[PDB]
Design a protein around this ligand. Structure first.
Ligand SMILES: C[C@@H](c1cccc2c(-c3ccc(CS(C)(=O)=O)c(F)c3)c(C(=O)O)[nH]c12)N1C[C@H](CN2CC(N)C2)OC1=O
Ligand SMILES: [Zn+2]
Ligand SMILES: [Zn+2]
Length: 232
């Protein structure tokens, strides 16, 4: 009833949307992994009379449910999707998207990693993002490569019309107590990558993590704090 959704308020196998700003929503879904249940976020950005999707809903059935939820709540077609790194919470569901008319994109680094690990593979490569600090425009968003953090390929997304910073899994929520799933992370570089985000997007008003609650700019510093203490 208007609070940011959590695993306790999303019915089994469903997806919820949350209005972030004019023409900006997050999507929230839950998934099981290694015997525990986790939420995850993605983004939806209005692109004229179409929608840009950032990240899948962590699995094929969740991503089908996402599309249905968008049709119900928004009613504009999703025409393009970007996955912000190679893990299943970002790309699992790309095959569903691709069979629903959505053109799927990711960096060449994400595509290589997804292929190597047996995850679903976005169709199109996003050039111009291979060097730390790189940024490109993609419809109504800017895509930014901050450097290695949660993964070596992680991208962040900025919505300049609304000053919304979608950090993806490079950014953690304020309640976090450790740096999440660090299997593919660079803990030593991650603070430097977060500093790059803070320097590039100082006017961000909303910051959305890859998992958990949105907040303000403090999510960035909090992230650096939890990563440095996880590494220690
Ligand atoms: C599919 C993905 C994955 C699965 C399950 C949980 C998470 C988590 C995760 C997020 C938050 C918390 C709570 S908190 C910050 O701790 O308070 C938390 F507890 C965990 C994150 C993240 O942090 O983004 N992601 C996860 N995967 C899979 C993976 C395995 N790799 C692939 C091989 N190369 C080995 O690595 C990863 O990220
Ligand atoms: Zn990940
Ligand atoms: Zn994640």
């Amino acid at each position: 009833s208007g609070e940011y959704p959590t695993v306790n308020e999303i019915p089994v196998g469903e997806v919820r949307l949350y209005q972030i700003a004019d023409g900006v929503w997050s999507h929230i879904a839950t998934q099981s992994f290694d015997g525990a249940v986790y939420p995850s976020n993605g983004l939806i950005v209005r692109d004229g009379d179409e929608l840009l999707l950032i990240d899948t809903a962590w699995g094929a059935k969740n991503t089908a449910a996402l599309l249905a939820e968008i049709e119900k709540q928004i009613g504009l077609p999703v025409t393009r999707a970007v996955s912000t790194h190679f893990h299943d919470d970002r790309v699992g569901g790309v095959d569903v998207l691709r069979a629903a008319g959505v053109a799927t994109y990711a960096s060449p680094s994400t595509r290589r990693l997804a292929e190597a690990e047996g995850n679903e593979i976005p169709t199109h490569s996003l050039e111009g993002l291979s060097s730390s600090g790189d940024a490109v425009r993609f419809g109504p968003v800017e895509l930014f490569y901050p450097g290695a953090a949660h993964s070596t390929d992680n991208l962040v997304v900025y919505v300049p019309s609304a000053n919304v910073l979608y950090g993806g899994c490079a950014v953690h929520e304020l309640s976090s107590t450790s740096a999440g799933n660090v299997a593919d992370a660079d803990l030593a570089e991650w603070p430097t990558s977060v500093e790059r985000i803070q320097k590039h997007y100082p006017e961000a008003e909303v910051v959305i993590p890859g998992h958990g609650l949105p907040g303000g700019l403090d999510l960035l510093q909090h992230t650096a704090n939890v990563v440095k203490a996880h590494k220690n």
